[PDB]
Every structure is written in C-alpha cells, then in structure tokens.
Amino acid sequence: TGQDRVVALVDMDCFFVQVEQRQNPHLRNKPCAVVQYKSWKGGGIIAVSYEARAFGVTRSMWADDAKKLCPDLLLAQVRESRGKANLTKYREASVEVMEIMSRFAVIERASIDEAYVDLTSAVQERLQKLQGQPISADLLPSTYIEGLPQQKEGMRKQGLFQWLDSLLTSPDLQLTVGAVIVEEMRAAIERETGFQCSAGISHNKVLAKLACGLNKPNRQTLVSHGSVPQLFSQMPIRKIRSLGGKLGASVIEILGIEYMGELTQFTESQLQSHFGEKNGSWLYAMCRGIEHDPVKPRQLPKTIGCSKNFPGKTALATREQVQWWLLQLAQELEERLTKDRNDNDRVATQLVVSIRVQSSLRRCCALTRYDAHKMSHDAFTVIKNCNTSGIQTEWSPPLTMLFLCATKFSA
DNA sequence: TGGTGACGCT
DNA sequence: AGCGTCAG
Ligand SMILES: Nc1ccn([C@H]2C[C@H](O)[C@@H](COP(=O)(O)OP(=O)(O)OP(=O)(O)O)O2)c(=O)n1
Ligand SMILES: [Ca+2]
Ligand SMILES: [Ca+2]
C-alpha cells in the first residue's frame, strides 16, 4: 500500500533572496526581491522574500509595479555577464546545499533549490541501533503532522504530541525517524550555509513535495498514509506534481471533479481509457497516495544551456547580430562547460541549437571542442535555411529567442 | 512581455 | 532526431 519507501523533498525558502541576503546583510528580514534587467519597467521579479509576499509581491511582476504594492521593497540584481543574465552565484550556492544533502543519503537533483532524498536505508540504520529508546519531541522542533491535532506553535506541539503518543517495521515509525533525520539535515544546511528551507517527508516523491509546501517557511511536514484521504478530500487537483498543466485541466473537464479524493471513485481501467495506460494507472494509484517513481541518484544536470529572449521590436533581423548573440551564448556556455569538465570529469558531446520566430525550431550537431567561436559558427551553419530573407545581409523573419544547449555527457 | 532543465511521444 | 509538456 505504498509504504515501502521513505522519501523526503527538501526545497529552499525564497532561495535567490536568501543568497543575496547572505551576501548583503542590509537585505535580511526586509521586504525585498531579486530582479532581472532594470531597463524594462524596473526589471522582472523572479524571487520574493516572505516579508514582501505579505505585501503581495509575486514572481513574474515588473519591479516598478511591485514598488507600487510595497514602497519599502529592496531590490537585488542578477549579475549580467554578456548582455544577458548570469546565474552562477545561485548555481554555486545550490551546489553548496546539494553536497551537504549528499552527505546523508542518495539525492535526486530536482531543481536548482530542491532535491529528493531516499531515506529508507538511513531510517533502518538508525532504527536498528538506538534500540527501543523512544522519540523525544525535542528531536522534531520544526515538524508538523498533517491532520493533527484531532498560537500556531501551540497547535504544532499538540499535533506532534498526539502523533508521538499514539506510536516495529511500522510505516509511521519509519516516517518519524526520517523526519528526525530531515530535521538534522536542515539544521546542518542552515549551520553550514546560513540558508533556510522547508521539507516534506512521506512514502513517495509527490506526497513529499506536497508536504514540503504545507508548512512554509523553515518548517517541515510529515504526511502519513493515514492523512492521505483527509488531505486529498479538499486538495485541488492542480497542486499535484504534473497535474498543474493541460493533463490536470482535462482530468477536471472530463471527470467533472475538483479535488484529488474524487479520483478514488474511478476504476483503473476507466482512467486508463480516459487518459492512457500509463496515466490511468498512475492516477488510480496517486489518488490513493501510492506512487512508484523512484529517487534517481543524479545530483548533476544532464544538459547545460543558455537562452536569450528578444521580444517585441528587439528581435534580431540582421545576420551580423545573429552572429554576435550566438557568439555571446557560446562564450558563456564555454566558460560553464570548462568548469563542468574540470569539476565533474565529463565532456559534452552534442550541441543543440534552438531558435524561435515571431522553441519553434531545434537542431543538433557535433560538440567536439569547448570553443566558443567553433560552437557559434556551427550553430549558425546549422540555422540558415530558416532565414527566408532574399536580401543576403538581413534576417527575416526576425528571431525572438536564441537557445544553446550542450548535452549527451560522457566521462 | 526571462532564463533554465527533465522528460515523454513519435 | 524533433516536438510537446511541466515546473522550479
Ligand atoms: N519561475 C521561476 C521559478 C524559480 N526561479 C528561481 C528563483 C527562485 O528563488 C528559485 C526557486 O524557485 P521556487 O519556485 O522553488 O521558490 P523560491 O525558492 O523563490 O521560494 P519558495 O519555495 O519559498 O516559494 O528558482 C526563477 O527564476 N523563475
Ligand atoms: Ca524554493
Ligand atoms: Ca522549489
């Protein structure tokens, strides 16, 4: 009944902002946001601290409008390195966090600021030793128990007490051990980086990711098999990982529902007929809290790319500047690629050029030398047929986006 | 009116 | 190989 594994999702709280605040102490505990390119409307916001989220500041929001919402909003700038954003600060901080996380159990790099962790073996290893010694509530100073109890911190402690009181090879005891380990993990992350995070502990990846978002920030939530019916009864379908797009929308359309629990009243063959073999099976299992997607041992990315958008009147309409932006992208890609070669002992072998006209086109070619000029020229070569232009020195129709991606990595 | 990444389907 | 989807 999907209680074999113990899986945690650790995601950092307002991560880019925590990075900038670790760099600039004037920004700590203040309503502030991280911005991209001041010129257009003060810059698009990409990261909002919680003190600023209280005012209503959101991602994908021009900084100038956010200042209308919150006048006291402080802004920290993303580094700009070749006429384009440079995110190496946050990638290095991410690696900082991922290594600490790797010190406890096998992790799956899920994004720049979160990882899944498979804690089965560590829970067993701690359960064999420590003997029958109980679980002090002092071992979980930030854990919530979803559905308990049946002063926000008073609520928290009452639920934790109800859980610990009502407690061999029991899945709930496993979850408790893993939650203690995650408390440890997170205290280590905070002591060694200054960064704060939330976490979800459960039996699979999706339940862990939902639990991590139940109690943000700087808190962790345990979700047991038993909390699942109650939790899913009012859980909007779109909050589940991969049900936030078109598939999750049509599930609601066809089945005429609203929450996860209502998927239980359907047979597995029904949902397979509705959404496919692999999707019907997965939904039938998911609505009952069961998922088998494993925690893959992969801390390192599989692709390395740079894109630049050229919206509106700024799209590229000369070959003289398509050349130049391809060269800029190849430059940053090459710096990152040499760092990857010397840090991770592996080489990219295939280059992917992606372009858009007013990712409408993607081609691939050979990646043989970590050379910016070679790669820019080969990417150009690979895209020329697209230039409908009859005039030799213009480019029509203009390009809205350029994308360069090194992939197919060999040791 | 941004800049990335994993994965599925054919 | 190229496109479509999903999300941090
Ligand atoms: N559309 C997005 C989503 C994320 N990010 C970057 C900046 C974020 O700091 C980081 C991770 O984003 P999350 O969605 O995980 O959320 P935050 O880390 O900002 O905070 P929280 O998880 O507390 O909401 O990735 C981004 O630039 N654009
Ligand atoms: Ca986060
Ligand atoms: Ca996240």
List bases in chain C with any atom under 7 Å of a protein Cβ: 1-8
Q: What resolution, expressed in A, was reported for this entry? A: 2.9
Question: What Å value separates CA A302 and C1' B7?
Answer: 11
Q: Which two tokens stand for residue A46?
A: 């990409």
- Structural contact between residues A202 and A196, judged by C-beta atoms closer than 8 angstroms: no
Token code pair at residue A363:
């081609």
Closest residue by C-alpha to C1' distance, nucleotide C4:
A359
From the CB of A85, is ligand 1 less than 6 Å away? no
DSSP A78: P
Of A174, A134, A135, A166, which Cα lies nearest the Cα of A150? A166
Report CA(A158)–ligand 3 centroid distance (Å). Answer: 29
Determine which residue's CA is closest to atom 5 belonging to ligand 1. Answer: A46
Rounded CA-CA distance A314/A324 in Å is 14
Judge whether A204 and A2 are in contact, CB under 8 Å: yes
Terminal-to-terminal C-alpha distance of chain A: 39
CA of A293 to C1' of B8 (A): 14
Token pair belonging to A362: 């993607």
Domains and CATH numbers, chain A: 7-14+89-228 (3.30.70.270), 15-88 (3.40.1170.60), 304-410 (3.30.1490.100)
Report how far residue A210's alpha carbon sits from residue A215's, in angstroms, rounded to the nearest whole number. 10
Give A213 Cα–ligand 3 centroid separation in angstroms: 9
Collapse the DSSP code of A55 into the 3-class scheme (helix H, G, I; strand E, B; otherwise coil) and give the result. Answer: coil
Looking at residue A208, the DSSP 8-state letter turns out to be: H
Strand C closer than 7 A to residue A248 Cβ: yes
- A401's CB contacts (< 8 A; 6+ apart) are A307, A308, A309, A310, A354, A355, A356, A359
A50 lines ligand 1 (CB under 6 A): no
Is A243 near strand C, with its CB below 7 A from some atom of it? yes
Looking at residue A242, the DSSP 8-state letter turns out to be T
* Technique that determined the structure: X-ray
- DSSP secondary structure letters along A132-166: T----GGG-TTEEETT----HHHHHHHHHHHHHHT
